UniProtKB/Swiss-Prot annotation, chains A, C:
Organism per entry: Escherichia phage T5 (Enterobacteria phage T5)
Protein name in the entry: Tail tube protein pb6
InterPro entries for this protein: Big_2, Invasin/intimin_cell_adhesion
Domain notes: The C-terminus possesses an Ig-like fold of the Big-2 family.
Chief location of this protein within or outside the cell: virion
Keyword rRNA processing (UniProt): no
Domain BIG2: 375-453
Description of how the protein assembles with itself and partners: Homotrimer. The tail tube is made of 40 stacked trimeric rings. Interacts with baseplate tube protein p140.
SMART domains assigned to the protein according to its UniProt record, in alphabetical order: BID_2
Compartments it resides in: Virion
Pfam families for the chain: Big_2 (PF02368)
Recorded GO CC terms: virus tail; virus tail, tube
Keywords: Late protein, Viral genome ejection through host cell envelope, Viral long flexible tail ejection system, Viral penetration into host cytoplasm, Viral tail protein, Viral tail tube protein, Virion, Virus entry into host cell
Length: 464, 155, 464
């Protein structure tokens, strides 16, 4: 009688089947592109004979149930909750399931976990045969229905100008189940209007898209205006089902396959220095089997005032040779896929979601890994007593200052590049001797990899 | 190909194969007297079948739970799986020679809206997804054109 | 300056190397799988020393040539020719050289001989060390060649349903000889369009395949719808080549081996009466060292109206113990071999080809050996003067009426089966005596092996 409507359907994500509370269930900001359903495998039996009386017969049997299909898209709207005062995306257990299979723990360091500054999602503890287990609850009008033991297969992140920032989720469940009784009241679990105002206070617009590309073999950072992009995280999950003739069967667990983090970035060719054309010609010139690039795509842009933004940080990526795409105005496409340091070392990449980004915050998130931990920005090597020169056979212990003063890693290395008339140790004691009449330089770079440069030309003379 | 869809008038689509298409110069027979006259055309057009009035009779033979399902649109076809056999001669071309009907298939797809009412679409769906059985035995009686006390055209 | 394609090959079968006419050579319609050639043997003489600085050198000698191999596939295409008005298959000399070692005589009664009703092949005259000798002529595009003194080694017939009736020929020849000049005009000898139309009017489809199997030890006919099968006519011909060390040698003569007529028949298991299951259970329950089965494989089906057909008849066959072939639908395999009554008797089996087989024609082919010779179908025995009973010490010379009225064998035998109150002679003069108060029977059967029954229950009493 009463017809169920699509627009009135609300989704609930849970980690447990009983005792649903605010810490285990949430209302998901799903769009109007929802779709789900479970199909089955069937077998037909035909008979082929040669007698005078052919047997035109066909007998059908049900054999098994395929995986339950579910897919929906949500808005990327990071925010801070009033309870914890820490930036968390509304759909945080989805990112936890995509990241690692451990118990949900925002106070840890692996998987989806927040902080006072930003919400960061790493895949360092992803090396599992089975990720975190969810339960997609589908409340269409009044009738209940949920999908048993869902697991996130992939997360489709679309980054295109003229398009608002969104993410599309698609996964599979063991068995979709319809329910008659309410598992839990949706009103108090569902987000109230105040946190809806708090969430809508932060929107991410993909029109402001700035890319950080830097090769680790040459450190040639480029300036590329983005036309449109897309990067997805794939788990390659396959459900395993038994094969029994007598009765039908349902899937039993799964084994996550190979982790894939691929992305496609479209951008216009530029003749300007460090532009798209220079990147393309450098890549098509140095044809190398292996690539090692710093790619840091920043959705929503960067600003001095706190602004909502989404960040991808791929430390050691693999850039496929670009193919310049012909159109009205030449716009090329670059394909990348983040490879790890070691196949089982994790650290494929990590993401940043928060409404409160300053350029320094995103910078230290990119270089150090967290939006809260500070990193060095500039370095000037300091002589032991404002000294400008050195004579032959004289010791000089180099000192150094770093900025900001709140940097977590402040120690720097000591090296000599230009000139051969002195030496430096781990502590910085520069030493000279006889037959040292030439000008020499001294270098200093911190171990956090900010790209900081500490330089000073000391005029080492022959002495008195 | 029988198509049963609302907003669509009842029609059937035929598709088959012949040994060899042949063009003819002489009239095999006069079309006028063989062709239907206007009176039987009036008699035929006196009866139309409209698929908008589609009522389904579904009943399982293991439980006898007849359902009440309003149809959104359907399609059922009868297939013979006919393949023509032709010889393979290198010197000259060849034409098909007879055929052997394969396996008889009578399949159909019925689209209908989910209903919370008793003996509705949702009850049928949940019963089927509850009693997962390899073999099914159902009374399906699709009635194109509807049913009425007065004489009405129906399929 | 030209390349030769396999599609332009034309094959002619001849019994003479000169004076080629339409009665000695005809074209054989071959298919893609045609193949022919001749291989050569060699030898390497290598020195095998053991010391340092050994000799490492070889040497090759051509020593012999192998027998030429040829094979091709043809369609079973019975038809009637306008010249003689007798049913004949286009590759009839192939059948003759397979069947007998005498000169071809279609008017005779052994080997390949035709009739106004059907074309027949029997192996009653194959006791020869060198069967009828052919010469395969090959015409590829423009160049000519032929194989000298061929012999039909075997003829494979595959009952592959949903396919056309086809036979595959194989054999050996003394030597393959390339001919530079045209032996005969292929335009005249090759089949013309009229006979091509007549042939294509008649095709044998393997789908319409009925099989007639009967246990001669129990008189039990089975209804087995076939799934797929094959039967072979094999001669096991081996070609002898002389060994000469100084010069290469080609085969000089041959010798036929053991004539084998085997088969293999696959079918599904049927629970119906006299089905496949009953045959399998009877065969595995008897467990007999020897079996006497009558097998009549009828390609093309049996019908009241005229239809083309190819029939293999095994009068006294030997059936192996069947096995169950576990597939999606359970089945079995009936592997048989046609054995003769006596080793030097021939008559292992025969074949009948025609484009006009009414059911009666194939029936009398099976039971009489020829499609033209009619065979008795039913019998009702008649007394002397329409008498219904008999009294003690009274004669009853019974007669017989048979159908059809044109059966070649109109005679019957006489026997008493049920009761002991009378005795019958060869002519049929039944005789009784006193003290005969029981009901006795009389039976008659034809001498052509049709399987016709003549029965009557005479109510002999003690008299008035």
């Amino acid at each position: 009688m009463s017809l169920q409507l699509l627009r009135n359907t609300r989704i609930f994500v849970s980690t447990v089947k009983t005792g649903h509370n605010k810490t285990n269930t949430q209302e998901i900001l799903v769009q109007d592109d929802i779709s789900w359903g479970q199909d089955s495998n069937s077998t037909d039996i035909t008979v082929n004979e040669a007698g005078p009386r052919p047997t035109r017969g066909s007998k059908r049997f049900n054999d098994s149930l395929n995986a339950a299909e579910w897919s929906f898209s949500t808005y990327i709207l990071p925010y801070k909750d009033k309870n914890t005062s820490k930036q968390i995306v509304p759909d945080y257990m989805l990112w936890h399931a995509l990241s690692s299979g451990r118990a949900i723990n925002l106070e840890g360091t692996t998987g989806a976990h927040n902080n006072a500054t930003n919400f960061m999602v790493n895949f360092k503890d992803n090396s599992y045969h089975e990720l975190a287990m969810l339960h997609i609850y589908i409340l269409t009008d009044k009738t209940w229905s949920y999908i048993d033991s869902c697991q996130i297969n992939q997360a489709e992140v679309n980054v295109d100008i003229e398009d608002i920032g969104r993410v599309t989720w698609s996964g599979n469940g063991n068995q979709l189940i319809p329910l008659d009784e309410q598992p839990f009241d949706p009103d108090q679990i569902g987000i109230d209007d105040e946190t809806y105002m708090t969430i809508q206070g932060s929107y991410i617009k993909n029109k402001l898209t700035i890319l950080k590309i830097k090769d680790m073999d040459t450190n040639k950072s480029y300036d590329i205006p983005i036309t449109g992009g897309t990067f997805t995280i794939n788990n390659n999950i396959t459900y395993l089902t038994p094969n029994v003739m007598s009765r039908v069967t349902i899937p039993i667990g799964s084994f996550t396959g190979a982790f894939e983090l691929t992305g496609s970035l479209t951008a216009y060719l530029n003749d300007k220095s460090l532009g798209s054309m220079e990147l393309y010609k450098d890549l098509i010139k140095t044809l190398k089997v292996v690539n090692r690039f710093e790619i840091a795509l920043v959705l929503g842009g960067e600003y001095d005032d706190e602004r909502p933004a989404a960040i991808l940080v791929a430390k050691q990526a693999h850039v496929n040779i670009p193919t310049i795409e012909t159109d009205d105005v030449l716009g090329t496409s670059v394909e990348f896929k983040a490879i790890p340091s070691d196949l089982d070392a994790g650290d494929e990449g990590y993401l940043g979601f928060s409404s409160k980004y300053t350029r320094t915050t995103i910078n230290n998130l990119i270089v150090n890994g967290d939006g809260a931990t500070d990193a060095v920005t500039a370095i000037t090597v300091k002589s032991a007593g404002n000294v400008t020169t050195l004579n032959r056979s004289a010791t000089l212990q180099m000192s150094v200052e770093v900025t900001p003063s709140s940097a977590r890693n402040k120690e720097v290395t000591w090296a000599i590049t230009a000139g051969d008339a002195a030496t430096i140790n781990a502590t910085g004691l520069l030493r000279a001797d006889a037959s040292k009449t030439g000008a020499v330089t001294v270098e200093a770079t911190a171990k956090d990899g900010s790209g900081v440069k500490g330089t000073k030309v000391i005029t080492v003379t022959a002495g008195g």
